[PDB]
Amino acid sequence: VCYKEGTGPCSESEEKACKTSGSCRGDMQFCKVAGCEHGEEASEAKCRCSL
DSSP, rough: OEEESSSSSSSHHHHHHHTOOSSSOSSSTTTSSOOOOOOOOOOSOOOEEEE
16 A cells, blocks of 8 residues: 555555656565665655555
């Protein structure tokens, strides 16, 4: 589940790209194999694809 932490979750078009992008941050195991790119978006990070 990709939730934005702002106004709840992030939109489908983002999360459709989020499954192909790594800029969308996430919790554990979304970066081990699902491949987060670990961007330094300290201000307004992308929607968190989590468990």
